[PDB]
Symmetry: none
Amino acid sequence: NSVSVDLPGEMKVLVSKEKNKDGKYDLIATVDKLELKGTSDKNNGSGVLEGVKADKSKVKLTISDDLGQTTLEVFKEDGKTLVSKKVTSKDKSSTEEKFNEKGELSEKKITRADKSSTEEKFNEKGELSEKKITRADKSSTEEKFNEKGELSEKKITRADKSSTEEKFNEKGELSEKKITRADKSSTEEKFNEKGELSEKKITRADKSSTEEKFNEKGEVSEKIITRADGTRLEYTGIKSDGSGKAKEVLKGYVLEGTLTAEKTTLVVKEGTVTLSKNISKSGEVSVELNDTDSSAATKKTAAWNSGTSTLTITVNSKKTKDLVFTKENTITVQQYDSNGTKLEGSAVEITKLDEIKNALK
Amino acid sequence: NSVSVDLPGEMKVLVSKEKNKDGKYDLIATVDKLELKGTSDKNNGSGVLEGVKADKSKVKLTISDDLGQTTLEVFKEDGKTLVSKKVTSKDKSSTEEKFNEKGELSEKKITRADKSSTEEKFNEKGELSEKKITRADKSSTEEKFNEKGELSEKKITRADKSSTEEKFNEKGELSEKKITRADKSSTEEKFNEKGELSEKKITRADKSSTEEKFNEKGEVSEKIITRADGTRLEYTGIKSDGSGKAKEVLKGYVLEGTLTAEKTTLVVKEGTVTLSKNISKSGEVSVELNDTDSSAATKKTAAWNSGTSTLTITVNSKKTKDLVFTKENTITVQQYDSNGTKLEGSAVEITKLDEIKNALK
Amino acid sequence: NSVSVDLPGEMKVLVSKEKNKDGKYDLIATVDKLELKGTSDKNNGSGVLEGVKADKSKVKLTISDDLGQTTLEVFKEDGKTLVSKKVTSKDKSSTEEKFNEKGELSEKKITRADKSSTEEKFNEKGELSEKKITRADKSSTEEKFNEKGELSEKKITRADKSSTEEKFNEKGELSEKKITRADKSSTEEKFNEKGELSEKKITRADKSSTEEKFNEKGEVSEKIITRADGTRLEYTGIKSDGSGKAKEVLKGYVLEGTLTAEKTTLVVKEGTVTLSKNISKSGEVSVELNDTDSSAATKKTAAWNSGTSTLTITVNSKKTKDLVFTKENTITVQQYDSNGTKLEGSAVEITKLDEIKNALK
């Protein structure tokens, strides 16, 4: 007595074989466990079907004449006010809509045949609150909005899980931006009241980081190199000629000094002795020792062995101590014997500025 | 006896000046060399005209009430099973459809008023086959789907000749993506079945490339730096402190060594002599030689000149050899005279690891 | 007699209270000083409205089903040829199109809900002329094309104002690339008509710079090194071994001279007294003085001490001048007493070249 026509969205519509009493084709379909009834002038499956839900909501299926689009509407009890609308097409793409309790738009999702989609939500005043764009390869950019339609949050998600998050002030101007990659590493930028860069911190996967402050002239006014081992170099008050004050912060003490474009000089003085930690522009440590003392039996000198980062000090023809500047960024003292030819005991890590100064006596 | 009305789809319908014997207006038009005849109540040009092709297939032209649309249908001999359908509107937008022998959809091209278009092909079971989107700037994305209707392949081609190729697996999951830029360089990514990046490969404009394997923590486990000259640095077993095993694959021989945060050291030992090719993080090479031998009569010292990438070897105050490390990534030997001052012969290219070793003797 | 409904674009559709003669709903609105009559089945403000401009141009507003989008087209007198099209949408995003005098695209602008936009200009033939994408964080890819459709300029500006500029040729090949960072530091490369690197300039964050011009074979034909305090060196006409004419540019004065594979020699004379400043490949500074005079009580000779870079001059067995060459790159002259035992007062920085020729008298 009837043939089936199968439709976009996996559904079938049943058309009467012969025309009915009114001169119309009867139509019957089952959607979400609910039976729908309809008539039309055509026998191909086109036309419109109604049905009522157990909760008195009204359901309206509408199939287009060429059968390439089903429209499924869910109305409240009164027939006028909308609850949800789904448009589906032969290529599987769709548009699903949600509505508030006035039949007015809440949510809209558009899904394309390649499964990509853009989504939008609207508050009760009809102003955008969030928008999400999902791409063919599952990657996503979500953005949030305040009540005055302005932007407040943006989050790009990359195919490689890497994400970028961007905050905006109440005015929609960029206030801050952080890439966070698959390494656990990240680059983070702060932006001033004028849209300019004020702060930049590149963190690396081994917890290490480098951070620069920027000034009115957009130069690097300060730089903080943070090493993975916890310590750090701190360059403050950087001028235009690449020079400023340098401060190395170690577990326990602090080494202080100067910066020039070429090299960082970290000095520590004790009586006439000044020890000098030098770092090149590339970052290779080197150490030197100078002594004002005009007395041979007490004048200190020292040789630097860059292959073992050790510095050996001598007094009156005799090696006194080895200062090693270790790869984990610590200094260790070990003493020589009275003959000045054998290292005694074991290395000792220096934990106080007073202990460096103590070796310089 | 009649008036031409020019229509959308560039065609004209002819309408007679007054009615016919049955009170209707006569309409005649010629389409692709076929004369279509029709009768309508109205004389504005609107109505339906039919004609029959010589192979018996029926043509139907339907001009809308307001002359705002033309539907040109072409059916099989039965007049019911569609073969093609074209709906052109007044703003020049259009819709071309092609049908299979069952009268079901096979191609739909939608053309918009600004000449841009979306085009879709469906297979014989009615699943999507491919989709092509041409945009205003002539850039175009080409998507291919499988017999099951899931995405398999997508290629964006941009107006600047840049392209983003994406391949997908049996599950609609991104397996591999290749962005290639307008400057002819290209980032390429591969993905495991978990979503995570398994391999990245950056090719530069000059055909040099950096291939990277990633681990489960996201860190880089293996690196292959390929130079333009074809030779490659193979870093493998890369540990979290930045260190790892290294291998340089040169024409005819392999240098071996280790890798640390700052540099790659490539080592070749012969007797007490050890030659060391050092490569910087920026790829800057520098060589040095050391010799355990004490006998001034046979100790090899060597000085490096970075300006010409060359190492001269010295035994007994007299220069012995030049080892030049070239920009095409080769090494050449040239002996001095017995007086130790004049280079003799012509430089000779080293091709064997023995030949480097034999020069260090 | 009617009720207001507000729409995307902040415009107003008036729909009449109920049906009239044909059973339809009358729609009316105002757009840019023009009234537009319209009619429809549904009553929510959906449907089409048409109106005639004073210059005979046609206007067609188009309001969608869910009331979320307005289309405002304007046509030439015919109603076939497009002039303008402005789609506006509920999320406040928008799309404007301008058409030349065959209804064919000239400019397309897309404004998004997050206030950002892309812009496309087309040429009189129909090709893409230029495209600028602007993002929420104000980051921007810009590109311009020649009337031949080929790419000419591609510049990417990042959120923090750091940019990457590429210029191409007539054949669509890379000719000039410049990466420029937020440190104000920048790399710049220039490629010849054959794709090889012809020119290279790295500007660093402290305004330090290295320029290298590469010749026809690929070698370095010129080099210009600029320090952090502004002063610089010019190496011009470099050959295979490294031989070429050198030049130094210090604040106030310029030393001319020669550069060979090992070092740079700058030559100045006062009489036969030739002073030579010598800079090694590593940059180690050294100075010496030769006199052709055959008189022991007047002949000038000087000593070089590289422990404090001082050049001590002596004439007639008596010390006269200390020429200290400082690491901030200036020269100082501290005179001695009449005998040559005591130093007089403080040092004096040289401000003219006339103050280097005047010392060697």
